[PDB]
């Protein structure tokens, strides 16, 4: 249907298969930061049903995402199925999910792509640091696509929310100073995004233990401490909320940690049977729009400490 | 080893795998004859063990080939295997033999790629008309290789030798009025190449019987008459005998006609067990190389006739 799409499955399928022939060692060299691997393809009257005709496709750094896909324990092959055996599904910068809802592509500015360059190496070093175990954008993948004068950039993450067990109620918290309430037009969407106030004004509980609520704030507080380092900010807590009673009305209301990893489920006092998917969303700055609301006073640090307070409280 | 051929089975491999995909009707369009197929693949600082980092593969008109394969009784997952699974081998223009030895891949010239394009309609219309009978070559795929500097072009076709039983005694055969003999160095070689007059001095025989005989005569006037209305000549008749005894000391002596297609036991009174191997080989004009030799009296018609007497007196 979407050239685009197509173009980017075709190069998703071909970017695996050479990394299947290729030998895979321990490390990654300084080197692998910098490369890029590209394919030109020119079909003169041939294969029209298809592909586009004439497109191109670049992956970025293959070898680091080979690594951290790895790391983050997806293997290739199973990677390459779920993005290649059937279209992603949009949902309307766009953004579509892997059909079977393992993986999330979202599209990106050529911005967004120097700054992931830039933090790709330190980020790479943090994920070993931690054996994988963050609340931050599991990073898989990084492509440039040329259609005929279009050219996207794109990003692949795992999905934070799970590919079995529907999603009822989803927020985005920052902790800003500032006020955050989600739209009238916004809070009547069909599975709207929720903000800072809609938490507290509906107060709303999470009823997790103390156990994973130590351990989740103490995954927090290193991750976030990563990223105001880095000197990044305006990242959000995407918190969305399984109801087991509200999917069996429409394992019983148990996942897999091992696909679904930012799942938590409920302590056995919990009001209703739920399962919590937390972690940190969109690290990046994308100065040029935060420039265009700009043209037409909290720095990273203050940021980072605003916001981890914040997660404290509604905890 | 040699990039060039890495490149041949890496196109190859991408080639056969991006027709797997396309739906293949009965019938070709004008345009597949004019059709092709464009990959430039640039790799900075990525997989420098396998590939070179820079390259071009170019197939001509994939779809006539695909059609052509199909009907000379080739599933493109075997041609995929046979050139893919392992390097082709040399013998010191160039040629290569697929590592089973199914298929021969032949280095040509932009001219000969030229010449063609120019015939390969005319020459897939033949194929139908016949059933895919021949003793012509079999051509099933053309393609141009780029390595950083270097431009070759190939063809590959079925090889007229077999894949289990060695060949012994090799002929080429022109039937001319000018004298034809291999060089007393050529004479020498580990596997000679002898021609004409090394046939008529030496008394060979070929021992089939008068049906096979007629088949194989009727066969060769057919493609024969077909090569000289292309205006085409300078073709040989390639004579490959093996020897069922000899190959013992060093089925019995049978051969899957599927396979090896060209083929024809001896019959029963023939003096040893031999299986013979023959078919039309070296179509193209390569003016190119036959301008050099004229640099440093028969035309197209006269050459049809010359040759199909010769080859009517030597069996």
Same sequence: chains 1, 2.
Avoid at 39 to 60: A, G, T
């Amino acid at each position: 249907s979407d050239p685009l799409l197509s173009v980017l499955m075709w190069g998703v399928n071909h970017s695996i298969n050479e990394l299947s022939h290729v030998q895979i060692p321990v490390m990654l060299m300084p080197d692998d930061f910098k490369a890029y691997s590209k394919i030109k393809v020119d079909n003169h009257l041939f294969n029209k049903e298809n592909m586009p005709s004439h497109f191109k496709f670049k992956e970025y750094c293959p070898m680091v995402f080979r690594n951290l896909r790895e790391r983050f324990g997806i293997d290739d092959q199973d990677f390459q199925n779920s993005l290649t055996r059937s279209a992603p599904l949009p949902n309307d910068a766009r953004f579509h999910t892997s059909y079977d809802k393992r993986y999330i592509i979202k599209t990106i500015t050529s911005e967004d792509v120097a700054e992931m360059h830039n933090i790709l190496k330190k980020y790479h070093q943090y994920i070993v640091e931690c054996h994988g175990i963050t609340l931050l954008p599991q990073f898989l993948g990084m492509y440039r696509l040329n259609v005929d004068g279009v050219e996207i950039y794109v990003i692949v993450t795992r999905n934070v929310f799970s590919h079995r067990l529907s999603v009822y109620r989803k927020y985005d918290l920052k902790g800003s100073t500032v006020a955050r309430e989600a739209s009238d037009k916004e809070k009547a969407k069909e599975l709207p995004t929720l903000k800072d106030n809609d938490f507290i004004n509906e107060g709303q509980k999470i009823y997790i233990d103390d156990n994973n609520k130590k351990v989740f704030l103490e995954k927090l507080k290193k991750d976030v401490e990563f990223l105001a380092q880095l000197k990044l900010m305006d990242y959000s807590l995407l918190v969305g909320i399984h109801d087991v009673e509200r999917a069996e009305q429409e394992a019983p209301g148990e996942f897999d940690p091992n696909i679904d990893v930012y799942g938590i489920k409920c302590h056995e006092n919990s009001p209703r049977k739920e399962v919590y998917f937390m972690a940190i969303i969109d690290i990046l700055t994308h100065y040029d729009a935060k420039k265009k609301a700009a043209h037409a006073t909290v720095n990273p640090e203050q940021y980072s400490k605003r916001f981890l307070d914040f997660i404290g409280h509604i905890l």
